[PDB]
Write a protein that binds this ligand. Structure first.
Ligand SMILES: [Mg+2]
Ligand SMILES: [Mg+2]
Ligand SMILES: [Mg+2]
Ligand SMILES: [Mg+2]
Ligand SMILES: [Mg+2]
Ligand SMILES: [Mg+2]
Ligand SMILES: [Mg+2]
Ligand SMILES: [Mg+2]
Ligand SMILES: [Mg+2]
Ligand SMILES: [Mg+2]
Ligand SMILES: [Mg+2]
Ligand SMILES: [Mg+2]
Ligand SMILES: [Mg+2]
Ligand SMILES: [Mg+2]
Ligand SMILES: [Mg+2]
Ligand SMILES: [Mg+2]
Ligand SMILES: [Mg+2]
Ligand SMILES: [Mg+2]
Ligand SMILES: [Mg+2]
Ligand SMILES: [Mg+2]
Ligand SMILES: [Mg+2]
Ligand SMILES: [Mg+2]
Ligand SMILES: [Mg+2]
Ligand SMILES: [Mg+2]
Ligand SMILES: [Mg+2]
Ligand SMILES: [Mg+2]
Ligand SMILES: [Mg+2]
Ligand SMILES: [Mg+2]
Ligand SMILES: [Mg+2]
Ligand SMILES: [Mg+2]
Ligand SMILES: [Mg+2]
Ligand SMILES: [Mg+2]
Ligand SMILES: [Mg+2]
Ligand SMILES: [Mg+2]
Ligand SMILES: [Mg+2]
Ligand SMILES: [Mg+2]
Ligand SMILES: [Mg+2]
Ligand SMILES: [Mg+2]
Ligand SMILES: [Mg+2]
Ligand SMILES: [Mg+2]
Ligand SMILES: [Mg+2]
Ligand SMILES: [Mg+2]
Ligand SMILES: [Mg+2]
Ligand SMILES: [Mg+2]
Ligand SMILES: [Mg+2]
Ligand SMILES: [Mg+2]
Ligand SMILES: [Mg+2]
Ligand SMILES: [Mg+2]
Ligand SMILES: [Mg+2]
Ligand SMILES: [Mg+2]
Ligand SMILES: [Mg+2]
Ligand SMILES: [Mg+2]
Ligand SMILES: [Mg+2]
Ligand SMILES: [Mg+2]
Ligand SMILES: [Mg+2]
Ligand SMILES: [Mg+2]
Lengths: 95, 107, 97, 148, 140, 166, 190
RNA sequence: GCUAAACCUAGCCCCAAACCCACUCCACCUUACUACCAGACAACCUUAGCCAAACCAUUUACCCAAAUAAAGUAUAGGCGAUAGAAAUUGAAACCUGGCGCAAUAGAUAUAGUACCGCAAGGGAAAGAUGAAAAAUUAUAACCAAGCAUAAUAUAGCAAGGACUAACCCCUAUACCUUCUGCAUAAUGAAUUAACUAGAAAUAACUUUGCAAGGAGAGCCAAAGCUAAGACCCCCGAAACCAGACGA
RNA sequence: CCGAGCCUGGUGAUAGCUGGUUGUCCAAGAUAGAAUCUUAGUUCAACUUUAAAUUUGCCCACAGAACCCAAAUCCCCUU
RNA sequence: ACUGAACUCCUCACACCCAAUUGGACCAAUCUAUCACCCUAUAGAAGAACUAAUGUUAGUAUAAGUAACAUGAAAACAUUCU
RNA sequence: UCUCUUACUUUUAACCAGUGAAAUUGACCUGCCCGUGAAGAGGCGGGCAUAACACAGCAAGACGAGAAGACCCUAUGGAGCU
């Protein structure tokens, strides 16, 4: 996506995925489930909880997001009071 | 291709097999170079195993030119006068040995 | 026909002349010259590339940004057209998307 | 390139297009994950394990007051001020095997690290810096090459 | 131009060399020759099996003819020879029939006698002394 | 271009021995850039080839074509050259060995067709070549006789042999 | 390669003069369809995939890698005995005759490279002989390089140059990580 | 044997440096290149559109004043495609070279000539001796397609297996492309010679180097970092818009 | 050659449509479907390919898999 | 009972029959660095390879020596005649 | 015009001589019947035919030359008009 710019000759990120998603340094991605703020009256509690809970993404679209994003979004970041520091690293993963 | 290429019937020179056998390869003429990476095979050949080759085959005669050459050649002359020029350009030692041996075998 | 009947004249190549014997000298100057000069400023060439690597459109945008103001009108027109074609090609056309 | 069509004609669509179908990132809603990331405050970690390692190697002397400038001169931690890291925070890990007695200056500090340093007899002091202040601190020489 | 091929002459004249003897504009031109020379080579390959088969059929015809000249037919002759344990392939059989018809007459008489032994056996399989020439050798 | 035909005469054979066959004097001659079609004058050339110069030039004189006169003046010039500076005793003791035609360096013009289309006219120039040889003309080979057919057939039947075996 | 810069440029169908309009129509005539003159197919046309202007083939290897290259080059020289050391560049005669004579006597080789510490201390005799000659080249310690020492069949060093090279290369091997480039001052590095 | 074939120069391209141009004999804005008379005649205006968004209608980089970095971040946006900074930092030389072409190449150029067009405008091709031509000497002879030298012989994609023998015998449904599937009576191709069409990023893999560090500021990192390698074509519309040219 | 002229320029306009796509040799290799102003296309899946870490993969032997109203199949330790 | 294959056996050697796609080993010619010197080697680079685009240019063939074209008559070449 | 055509003349035409084009052309040594076959065969299978080579006529076929079908469909191609 815009593999070369006219002003600097570099790749360019789509801010859509920035607004929608989040990346962890492991390479994984997380997202808010669709349909979580619409038509809640007819949805049963279990369903709306499935919608409230975050979810990961399979590797195809993970690669899609990684390709369209730049390395600035893939770097390591040391934030304060970040609930995702527990998860920016991976533990007990073989093959 | 057969029809485009000539043809012949089998025939041995002078019926060599009946009486005493004679190597139909008369003469060899090596043309090698001091320098040139292509001529290293021939240079090491004449270093090591031309001596024992001549000892094994006294009937054949060998001449070596050892002059400036981009491609080393070997010429073979037979009793009929048939000539066979072969390029040993950048070629392995054992393969050169096999080649010269089959040329000695060839009529 | 493409072949030539007669040989060409022999190319004389004096493998020992000024620059062939002097070649490469003063390239580690930065390393064993207490870092007074880097080899990028040492080379002779255009101003839009002195120690820079880049593909076609990168070079084009760089040379219009740097030396574009000094450029002739026809050259700058052809160059703008070139960057336009290259932008749309690299970004819209090809495999791998 | 294939036989025929956009594949070898070179006219395949942009990345993330599913033939008019609403793309994945388009159908997925927006949520406030990464907002003000360019304004969120950052600090690089530092472990007491690494600090003891550097003290043992002797690149930074505990006899003198340790500062982030001495850390950056010892290459204990890299700094990227224009990447909006306002300094360095200590880490609980490494409280054991620690006998530095250091008069450490820091930006952020863990209570356990503070307790360990105070047990070993050292001193901990926090000090806030600006972005450009931190730049000229972690790289003093380039700032002095200007004359300001 | 920075890189241009110069040996086109040679790399096409090799094809024309292989196609020299053809007829018409094929021998002269190249694109008319390439489509034909590769065809000739594929036919040279596929002609080997046909050579094998044709020469086999020719030996068959010759042997059948010589047998009928002696009054025998090829299937019976071959069956009797195999029964009598003589594996003479059709090439040498035809060559023998040509260059020494006396030995071929002997072979045909042998085959006929073996047919007669086989007919006696068809009459009585066992309960009889086996044919002298139908007798077999056992290897171990 | 090429003009080897004129050089063909410049050669000089070495002296011949007393006790050897007298060599027959041969010469070449040609004319260049005639306004006529080679396809047309080739007929004249192969008519005159294989006979005596006199009979040839007679046929040409009485042939109602344009190339015939040119050919006959060429032959007369060749005859005169041969007698004057080629050591030819008898001017009439000549016969043609090789008479041929060839294309020349032509010119290209325009003819106009209808509806604005145009065609190209190719003005034709032709070179003419002849080789003369002294001595009587060689006789034409008569048709092979029935006995010749028969002996060829029987020698073929005798040359055939067995195939695909010893 | 790194200092190389190309200069080839070829004109494309847009850069070649003319060729804007369509020469003949699409459907009327029996000729093939063509959009303009100066396409790559036509004579006088442009190049489709050609050398696109003055290119750059610049790229920098790591300082440590370059140091190791120099180290191993003069190492293999020392090993193959085409290396030689002397106290200084001094000779009374100072002529190419004596220089080539000494070379042929000591069995150095056809091509020789001389190394000196700085650019100013080369005596008149040596500088004049080397300027008159071409195969016996001279360089300061700064200009030393694998390319020249490989091209020259022999290499010649002086003790100050040896000390200089040892210092620099061992400093590279024991080097400390950079924070700001070494062009600027440091506590220990001059 | 002719037709032909072969050449190496002219010159040109890319950079760098340096700022550059005009008879001053006559004539040339009336119908230009025409020696000589009463007019009141004067310019300062957003570019748009193709295309992309797989439609299209908001929108879609094209510069206007330091190279690198920050940064493709802050931001904007049918929050979609896509567009996109700044503060701040801060570069080190003379120009006379070419891993640029050598007559289908390279400037279109032997020339903006011939030629075509009312006009704007479009726009070419080629040449080759030798030290001396006040030496036309002179095998340089040998090579593309095309012919003649030298027509023809039952029957067959023109060949192969072969054969004593060229043929006669057995075998064998031209090529490419497209297509479920072509000898197919589906396309393309007269033939020779020359020109003519896969350019690229992260992210991975291989090879080196160093290593809790790597990199010759800036960036990355829970064995990573730096360098190299290799990876993504050509021809073609009807159309649209702006400005000139034409009764 | 006016359903609206010709010339120049944007302009190498675009084209999911047609054609073409240049040296040699070896190997593996046609594969369920969904969505799409989508059905001459594309994205994912599936299949195919390459390099690596690990171990079970395939065939399958008894038992086992519904009331309503057949050939076979799923699962499956052994071999 | 026989005939009957690229099946199988038989002597020798074996990487040497699939579209799209993908993975590998070699390499023509060129410049460059370095060698070599009757034309080659090791490395890098690229305007790096054409039996086909109603492909462009030039030449030459088939159709074809075909279609098509032309000069009123006589004579002294002065004239005369239709 | 026709029943129902004929005869004559000029051109045309054919022959001799001069000059000398185009569209087309994969290579061709270019037969018929039946059958098959991408469903209509000069090229395939089975039969038949068969000294070679021109000139002049015919138009049955070569799905003949010609013009990238205008009819119909498709294109998230156009354009005019309302
Ligand atoms: Mg195609
Ligand atoms: Mg497709
Ligand atoms: Mg498109
Ligand atoms: Mg020829
Ligand atoms: Mg068999
Ligand atoms: Mg243009
Ligand atoms: Mg236009
Ligand atoms: Mg166009
Ligand atoms: Mg050009
Ligand atoms: Mg618009
Ligand atoms: Mg700034
Ligand atoms: Mg030109
Ligand atoms: Mg030109
Ligand atoms: Mg036949
Ligand atoms: Mg195709
Ligand atoms: Mg079909
Ligand atoms: Mg298919
Ligand atoms: Mg078929
Ligand atoms: Mg057909
Ligand atoms: Mg046909
Ligand atoms: Mg058709
Ligand atoms: Mg079609
Ligand atoms: Mg060609
Ligand atoms: Mg590439
Ligand atoms: Mg529009
Ligand atoms: Mg009027
Ligand atoms: Mg129009
Ligand atoms: Mg008009
Ligand atoms: Mg296009
Ligand atoms: Mg395979
Ligand atoms: Mg389509
Ligand atoms: Mg199981
Ligand atoms: Mg087998
Ligand atoms: Mg095998
Ligand atoms: Mg395939
Ligand atoms: Mg080679
Ligand atoms: Mg090319
Ligand atoms: Mg072609
Ligand atoms: Mg046509
Ligand atoms: Mg056609
Ligand atoms: Mg005709
Ligand atoms: Mg006529
Ligand atoms: Mg008339
Ligand atoms: Mg009548
Ligand atoms: Mg007629
Ligand atoms: Mg005529
Ligand atoms: Mg023509
Ligand atoms: Mg039929
Ligand atoms: Mg048939
Ligand atoms: Mg038949
Ligand atoms: Mg018809
Ligand atoms: Mg038709
Ligand atoms: Mg059509
Ligand atoms: Mg559609
Ligand atoms: Mg539309
Ligand atoms: Mg439109």
């Amino acid at each position: 996506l815009t593999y070369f710019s006219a002003r600097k000759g570099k790749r360019k990120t789509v801010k859509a995925v920035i607004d929608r998603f989040l990346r962890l340094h492991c390479g994984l991605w997380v997202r808010r489930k669709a349909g979580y703020k619409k038509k809640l009256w007819k949805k049963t509690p279990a369903r709306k909880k499935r919608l409230r809970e975050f979810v990961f993404c399979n590797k195809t679209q993970s690669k899609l997001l990684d390709k369209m994003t730049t390395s600035f979004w893939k770097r390591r970041n040391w934030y304060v009071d970040d609930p995702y520091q527990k998860y920016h690293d991976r533990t007990n993963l073989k093959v | 291709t057969a029809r485009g290429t000539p043809s012949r019937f089998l025939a041995s020179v002078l019926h060599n097999g009946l009486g005493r056998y004679v190597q139909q390869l008369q003469r060899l003429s090596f043309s090698v170079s001091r320098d040139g990476a292509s001529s290293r095979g021939a240079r090491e050949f004449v270093e090591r195993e031309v001596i024992d080759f001549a000892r094994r085959n006294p009937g054949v005669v060998i001449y070596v030119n050892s002059r400036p050459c981009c491609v080393p050649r070997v010429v073979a002359e037979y009793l009929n006068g048939a000539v066979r020029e072969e390029s040993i350009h950048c070629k392995s030692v054992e393969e050169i040995s096999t080649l010269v041996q089959k040329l000695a075998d060839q009529s | 026909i493409g072949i030539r009947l007669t040989l060409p004249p022999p190319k004389v190549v004096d493998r020992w002349n000024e620059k062939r014997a002097m070649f490469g000298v003063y390239d580690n100057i930065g390393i064993l010259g207490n870092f007074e000069k880097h080899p990028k400023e040492l080379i002779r060439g255009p101003i839009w590339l002195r120690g820079w690597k880049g593909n076609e459109l990168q070079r084009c945008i760089r040379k219009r940004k740097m030396v574009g103001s000094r450029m002739f009108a026809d050259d700058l027109h052809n160059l703008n057209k070139r960057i336009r074609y290259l932008y749309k090609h690299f970004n819209r056309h090809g495999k791998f998307r | 390139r294939g036989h025929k069509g956009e594949r070898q004609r070179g006219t395949r669509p942009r990345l993330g297009f599913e033939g008019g179908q609403t793309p994945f990132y388009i159908r997925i809603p927006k949520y406030g994950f990464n907002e003000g990331h360019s304004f969120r405050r950052q600090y690089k970690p530092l472990s007491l394990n690494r600090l003891q390692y550097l003290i043992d190697l002797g690149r930074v002397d505990p006899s003198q007051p340790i500062d982030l400038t001495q850390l950056v001169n010892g290459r204990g931690v890299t700094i990227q001020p224009l990447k909006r890291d306002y300094g360095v925070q200590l880490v609980e890990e490494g409280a054991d095997t620690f006998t530095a007695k250091v008069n450490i200056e820091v930006q952020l500090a863990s209570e356990l690290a503070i307790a360990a340093i105070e047990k070993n007899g050292g001193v901990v002091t926090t000090a806030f810096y600006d972005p450009r202040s931190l730049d000229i601190v972690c790289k003093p020489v380039p700032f002095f090459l200007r004359g300001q | 131009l920075r890189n241009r091929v110069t040996d086109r002459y040679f790399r096409i004249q090799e094809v024309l060399k292989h196609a020299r003897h053809f007829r018409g504009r094929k021998n002269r031109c190249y694109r008319l020759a390439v489509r034909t020379v590769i065809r000739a080579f594929v036919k040279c390959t596929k002609a080997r099996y046909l050579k094998k088969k044709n020469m086999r059929t020719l030996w068959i015809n010759r042997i059948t003819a010589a047998s009928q000249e002696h009054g025998l037919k090829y299937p019976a002759l071959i069956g009797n020879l195999v029964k009598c344990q003589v594996e003479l392939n059709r090439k040498v059989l035809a060559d023998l029939a040509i260059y020494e018809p006396k030995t071929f007459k002997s072979l045909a008489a042998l085959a006929s006698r073996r047919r007669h032994e086989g007919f006696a056996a068809a009459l009585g399989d066992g309960k009889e002394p086996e044919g002298i020439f139908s007798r077999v050798v056992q290897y171990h | 271009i090429s003009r080897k035909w004129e050089k063909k005469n410049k050669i000089v054979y070495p002296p011949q021995l007393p006790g050897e066959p007298r060599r027959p004097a041969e010469i070449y001659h040609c004319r260049r850039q005639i306004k006529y079609s080679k396809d047309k004058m080739w007929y004249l050339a192969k008519l005159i080839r294989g006979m005596s110069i006199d009979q040839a030039l007679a046929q040409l004189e009485f042939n109602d074509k344009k190339g015939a006169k040119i050919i006959k003046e060429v032959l007369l010039e060749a005859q005169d050259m041969a007698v004057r500076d080629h050591n030819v005793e008898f001017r009439s003791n000549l016969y043609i060995a090789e008479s041929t035609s060839g294309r020349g360096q032509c010119l290209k013009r325009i003819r106009y067709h209808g509806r604005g289309r145009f065609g190209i006219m190719e003005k034709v120039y032709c070179h003419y070549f002849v080789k003369l040889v002294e001595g009587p003309p060689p006789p034409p080979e008569p048709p092979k006789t029935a006995v010749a057919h028969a002996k060829e057939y029987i020698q073929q039947l005798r040359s055939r042999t067995i195939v695909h075996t010893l | 390669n790194f200092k190389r810069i190309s200069y080839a440029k070829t004109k494309t169908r847009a850069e070649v003069r003319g060729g804007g309009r369509k020469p003949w129509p699409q459907k009327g005539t029996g000729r093939a369809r063509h959009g303009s003159i100066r396409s790559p197919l036509w004579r006088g046309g442009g190049v489709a995939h050609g050398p696109r202007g003055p290119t750059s083939y610049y790229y920098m290897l790591p300082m440590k890698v370059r140091a190791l290259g120099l180290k191993v080059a003069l190492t293999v020289k020392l090993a193959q005995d085409d290396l030689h050391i002397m106290d200084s560049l001094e000779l009374p005669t100072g002529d190419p005759q004596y220089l080539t004579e000494l070379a042929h006597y000591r069995r150095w080789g056809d091509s020789v490279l001389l190394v000196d510490l700085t650019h100013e201390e080369m005596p008149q005799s040596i500088v004049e002989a080397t300027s008159r000659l071409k195969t016996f080249n001279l360089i300061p310690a700064v200009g030393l390089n694998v390319h020249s020492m490989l091209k020259h069949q022999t290499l010649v060093l002086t003790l100050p140059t040896v000390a200089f090279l040892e210092d620099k290369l061992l400093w590279q091997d024991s080097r400390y990580r950079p924070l700001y480039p070494f062009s600027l001052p440091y506590s220990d590095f001059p």
